[PDB]
Structure 1
Amino acid sequence: SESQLKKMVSKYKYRDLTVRETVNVITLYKDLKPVLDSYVFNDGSSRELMNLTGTIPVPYRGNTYNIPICLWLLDTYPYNPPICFVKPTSSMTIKTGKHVDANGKIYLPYLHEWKHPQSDLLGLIQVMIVVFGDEPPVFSRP
């Protein structure tokens, strides 16, 4: 709902933008949920940031998988890219690669060259579904 969301991002720099993009991706991707949770920065501090967490559908060789991810929105959003992770369940393992480290953090050209209004969440997820579709970031263990 537009109301509950507006309250979550109370302490955001650009709330009107952040919510409208948020509403759009949650609509299109029914299984991504907005959530508050403390993020720990490189310095050691903890701000309470919104986290679009859930799964996205990703075709991989004839089969569609629900790849689990985390999209951390900084409070300066949309003028900085989200901080993106894959969130492997305990039965999955992270496939390390060019776009993924062992902590599950995602690295993409789209994130690097992020620029508002040129870039937004919907665009990022579109790209993700392509990158993971070619090279899955997570695999299920035997």
Structure 2
Amino acid sequence: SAVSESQLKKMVSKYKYRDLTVRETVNVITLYKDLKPVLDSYGGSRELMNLTGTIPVPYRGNTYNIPICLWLLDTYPYNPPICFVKPTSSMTIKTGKHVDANGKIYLPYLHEWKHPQSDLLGLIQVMIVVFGDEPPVFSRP
């Protein structure tokens, strides 16, 4: 149950920067075992690859597996990913500074994104720190 680089290259066939996107995706899924690459229709408009799953976020002495979806545009890594928190039936989205009504994530890291200094490993690192202070979702009481 693991994705081969070959399968990843096929998923980004229509991408403008393929090797770069594959390279970073491999890095991300290797370090974050709970994120999985999936080719899906973005908003039912067009196919793009995204990293789906959870990232470990420590909050008040406990670690939570926050559900997220990182959409890699066909311009990745030159343009930042479009990121969303994805609440399950047992939780709700906490709208605030870094999360809007739709669960879309907003971070300075994304706003000033610039290749090659900016990357997914850096972005996820930021999310763990930022969400650790302000969770993007909470379990339903």
How far apart are 1:90 and its partner, in Å? 1.2
SS class of match (1:80): coil
TM-score by length of 1: 0.95
State yes or no: 1:138 paired with 2:141: no
Change in CA separation of 1:98 and 1:31 when aligned onto 2, cut-off 3 Å = same
For 1:92 and 1:139, locate their aligned partners in 2 and report how far apart those are by CA, in whole Å: 5
SS class of match (1:51): strand
How far apart are 1:38 and its partner, in Å? 1.1
> How many residues end up aligned between the 2 structures?
138
For 1:67 and 1:108, locate their aligned partners in 2 and report how far apart those are by CA, in whole Å: 16
Change in CA separation of 1:62 and 1:116 when aligned onto 2, cut-off 3 Å = same
For 2:127 and 2:103, locate their aligned partners in 1 and report how far apart those are by CA, in whole Å: 14
Change in CA separation of 1:63 and 1:17 when aligned onto 2, cut-off 3 Å = same
SS class of match (1:126): helix
Q: For each residue in 1:95-120, what CA deviation from the matched residue of structure 2 results, as whole angstroms up to 9, or x when unmatched?
A: 11110011100000000010000101
Moved over 3 A (4+): none
> Which residue pairs with 2:14 in the alignment?
11
For 1:45 and 1:51, locate their aligned partners in 2 and report how far apart those are by CA, in whole Å: 14
How far apart are 1:31 and its partner, in Å? 0.3
Q: For each residue in 1:20-72, what CA deviation from the matched residue of structure 2 results, as whole angstroms up to 9, or x when unmatched?
A: 00000000000000001111xxxx88221001010000000000000000100
Give the % identical residues.
Answer: 99
TM-score by length of 2: 0.95
Change in CA separation of 1:112 and 1:20 when aligned onto 2, cut-off 3 Å = same
RMSD: 1.1
SS class of match (1:76): coil
Runs of 5+ unmatched residues, structure 2: none
> Which residue pairs with 2:32 in the alignment?
29
For 2:35 and 2:122, locate their aligned partners in 1 and report how far apart those are by CA, in whole Å: 15
